[PDB]
UniProtKB/Swiss-Prot annotation, chains A, B:
It catalyses: a 2'-deoxyribonucleoside + ATP = a 2'-deoxyribonucleoside 5'-phosphate + ADP + H(+). Signal peptide: none annotated. One of its GO terms (cellular component) is cytoplasm. ATP binds at residues 16-24. One of its GO terms (biological process) is nucleoside phosphate biosynthetic process. Substrate binds at residues 41, 59, 70, 94, 161. The chain holds residues 12 to 208 of 250 of the full protein. Subject to feedback inhibition by dTTP. Belongs to the DCK/DGK family. The lineage of its organism: Eukaryota, Metazoa, Ecdysozoa, Arthropoda, Hexapoda. It comes from Drosophila melanogaster (Fruit fly). The active site is at residue 93. Keywords: ATP-binding, DNA synthesis, Kinase, Nucleotide-binding, Phosphoprotein, Transferase. This is Deoxynucleoside kinase.
Length: 197, 197
């Protein structure tokens, strides 16, 4: 019997590249706060971990900070996945699955995460699967081109993202495609594709 | 309810400094193994995580590797704490508590863990406490002098531990005292103190 098992409503995960408009899309649901559990913009947690900006530290020095940063992403997603609600609907920006299948995998490929750091994160994912219930009934995938993602990133202008290269977003885009369109990853529930260009 | 709640027998934790004799002490129960769940020598997991020696890497480069290493230590302890058994007694070498209250404390103090890494591990520890059940009925404390621990470490001669100085063991000793003697930490059930010198 897993933690939070049987405590969760029908759950929708809002996914897509950085700057695909996940927060914008979820903002339309806000007037319905009373009926829907909305867990949005988890990045604010990562930018301020009791005063520490892990997002900043990660981009400045990935070979040292990518590991703690992803471990903390994993935690905050878990907190949101397992958060109690009395409501019939929960909608989340991001999920433990995108952290794992896109970000962690990409950082393994680019060498930000050495094998040992990758292995530790992966062993955690496996234990989490056996011990903690992650409700997932629908994923809405905001599909975008890397060029479009890139312009939104620049317009929003997060200081931490000011050095994010187009190639990185191309890498992440394909990984979202692998996961949500080509079913290269084990995880499976309904996916609704939307054009966010 | 938390993961593993109501699944665990009376649980004994064996604690003490590096080289204090936890495994040696647990060896005395080997003939009772069919009636006691015995989880010994977790360092063997940390020396080989699919071929990666996390212990070795932590000691060669703590500013980089102490974080992922402590994260994996935490995981493996948790795997042992929550492991199913039909036996009426469980005895474990180490616990999540000594990893948190002794090793992580010391690595933060000596600057092996930056605030960001420290904060990440602590946020995990907090969530684990909410989500995962850790059975703890007795701690047996194999109390040693740092000097004797040092001798035993040198005799055993783990290559990973070749550069461990007496000062490090003195530091850990006072953190074991702080927790198990002075009780300046949260719970810790009853403690039975043994002279392992
Ligand atoms: C989920 C996740 C985000 N990140 C980073 C990428 C971004 O710099 C930042 C937030 O990314 P996103 O999770 O994509 O959030 P966003 O607000 O940028 O998305 P949108 O514009 O569609 O609303 O965190 C990781 O490094 N690893 C991760 O696992
Ligand atoms: C539990 C723990 C151990 N360690 C390290 C210290 C040691 O080098 C190694 C194993 O230490 P110990 O957990 O003390 O195990 P041991 O086998 O050396 O003890 P004993 O001789 O009493 O049987 O792991 C950490 O770095 N962090 C931790 O949280
Ligand atoms: Mg957003
Ligand atoms: Mg031992």
């Amino acid at each position: 019997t897993k933690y939070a098992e049987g405590t969760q409503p029908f759950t929708v995960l809002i996914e897509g590249n950085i700057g695909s408009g996940k927060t914008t899309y979820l903002n339309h649901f806000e007037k319905y706060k009373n009926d829907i559990c909305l867990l949005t913009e988890p990045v604010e947690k990562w930018r301020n971990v009791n005063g520490v900006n892990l997002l900043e530290l990660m981009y400045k020095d990935p070979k040292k900070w990518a590991m703690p940063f992803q471990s903390y992403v994993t935690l905050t997603m878990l907190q949101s996945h397992t958060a109690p609600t009395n409501k019939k609907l929960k909608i989340m920006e991001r999920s433990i699955f995108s952290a794992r299948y896109c970000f962690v995998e990409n950082m393994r490929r680019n060498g930000s995460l050495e094998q040992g750091m990758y292995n530790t994160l992966e062993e955690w994912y496996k234990f989490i699967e056996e011990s903690i219930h992650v409700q997932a009934d629908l994923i809405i995938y905001l599909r975008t081109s890397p060029e479009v993602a890139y312009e939104r990133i620049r317009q929003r202008a997060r200081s931490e993202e000011s050095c994010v290269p187009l190639k990185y977003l191309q890498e992440l885009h394909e990984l979202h495609e692998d996961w949500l369109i080509h079913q290269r990853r084990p995880q499976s529930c309904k996916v609704l594709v939307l054009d966010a260009d």
